Symmetry: C2
């Protein structure tokens, strides 16, 4: 046979990024150790791997956005959100002024539109019918984690991204070229779809259902440690950020520092799943035909051990 | 029921993404895994010391680790097997900068802060001391993870364990950044110090969980075929291959990483074969370090490789 391992696998939604600070900081400051937890932090090379891995139990826990978490279980990969990390970050179609793309959705006709994995394309395809268009009126291009990079390189004309990550990259890159950073703009997806929030892109703590049912204390203790790191980071951002970069030097760049400052306001303080946000995205998912008509949102706040705000 | 299964096979690197990982990524990028009907989920560790336990316990299917770690994993009850070789015998040693009081003499290490990655580097340095009129208390070992060269440059350690084509290139480039002579980046070779002859103890290997191997022999063979296909292309088209890799992983587009790749290039195993003699020497070394029991048998196999040993 084999020896047992207490290492709990935690798979990020993305390559290591500024908003992952509470996870790494919880490890770095020994908060996991203090809860007698050993967390193996893993980074995906492809974000589209993440929900199948967690859902199948090949990975115990991780992060993903809300729309992905919903779809994972509708697709037969039983994950559950046990908490929130990054709340409603502004999400949209990022573009550069002077490329012919304007605030009119119709300006996207015939454009190459980058998306990350799969769901971004589904979303844009659905939007088209709301603006006298069809999914053939543009070319969707799968870009993984390089949407902003490929916009800058000219290989796509615009692309789906988050304001505090992708738009910051564009802004900083414009500046470096001696261009106006305000040329970096975004058609908000929540505006286009008329939603009211970008809650569909709230980044959540998720876990496999069986892992939850079999390690209820580990889950609760994991969230205590995250909460402690989150409290610390929010009260001492500069010092926490420096701690994070000392461990992951990529975070020590000016570019990631700018991103972190933009991420800062979006961090969930309480880690709570916001009920109204889940209801609204659930309905959005059904509208997108990726969730069945009577689908129940897959989240819980029961492993959080402090008052709901 | 609604619970669906996955076809994804998890593959965990030994380290954050680095130039020598090109054959793994390239096999995916150029569609070689898909051509073999394999869906490989490439994962990157934040902590290299997590890897062998994750593969050994079966939590992760396959991955990479160096020989010493691979032998040690199964000796400790985490059953993995090397199924092929990625990076052959890369020069490994205690890296330092000229002028800091450290010299080719092991005894200059007295009272110094010596960085190591995870666990075994300290074991190795500790054992070395007694051959040089020293004890493990005659230096201060500092656990550094993947940031040994960084911390040498930042001065929070005096020297540390690293491989020539990664850590030493890092010191060389930073020295030029400072207007210094890059030749000031030196190492005390650990193979020389330990009387080994080769740095096969740091040969980086393709490894797999033993149960995964027994239950999926065809997937393993196919994985290695796709790896071999990527490896041939990369060795025959290094510039084009490197550019493909960097287009996917932008960090690989830096001048520093390009110089690391050029230095890694000579070390890539061309046939992926485990070298039997190397395993024998490293087995005995690990027994000597007391990390392997006296009757221990090397945990590797070449039987999933689909072309002859040249």
């Amino acid at each position: 046979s084999h020896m047992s391992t207490n290492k709990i696998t935690f798979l990020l939604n993305w390559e290591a990024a500024p908003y992952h600070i509470p996870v790494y900081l919880a490890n770095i400051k020994g908060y996991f150790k203090d809860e007698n937890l050993d967390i193996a932090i893993l980074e995906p090379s492809n974000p589209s791997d993440v929900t199948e891995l967690v859902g199948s139990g090949k990975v115990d826990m991780g992060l993903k956005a809300m729309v992905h978490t919903l779809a994972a279980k509708a697709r037969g990969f039983p994950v559950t959100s046990i908490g929130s990390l990054l709340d409603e970050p502004f999400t949209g179609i990022c573009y550069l002024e002077g490329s012919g793309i304007t605030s009119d959705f119709q300006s996207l006709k015939g454009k190459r539109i980058g998306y990350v994995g799969e769901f971004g394309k589904i979303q844009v395809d659905e939007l088209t019918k709301h603006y006298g268009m069809t999914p053939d009126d543009y070319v969707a291009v799968r870009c993984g984690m390089n949407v902003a990079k490929y916009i800058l390189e000219g290989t796509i004309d615009c692309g789906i991204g988050i304001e505090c990550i992708q738009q910051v990259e564009l802004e900083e890159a414009l500046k470096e070229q001696g261009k106006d950073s305000n040329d970096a703009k975004m058609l908000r997806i929540d505006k286009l779809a008329e939603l009211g929030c970008c809650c569909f892109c709230t980044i959540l703590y998720i876990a496999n259902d069986k892992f939850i049912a079999e390690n209820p204390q580990a889950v609760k203790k994991f969230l205590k440690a995250i909460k402690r790191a989150t409290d610390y980071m929010l009260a001492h951002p500069r010092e926490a950020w420096a701690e994070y970069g000392n461990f992951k030097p990529t975070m020590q760049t000016d570019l990631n520092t700018k991103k972190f400052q933009r991420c800062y306001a979006y961090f969930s303080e309480s880690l709570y799943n916001v009920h109204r946000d889940w209801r609204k995205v659930n309905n959005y998912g059904k509208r997108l035909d990726i969730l069945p008509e009577n689908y129940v949102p897959n989240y819980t706040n029961e492993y959080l051990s402090w008052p709901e705000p």
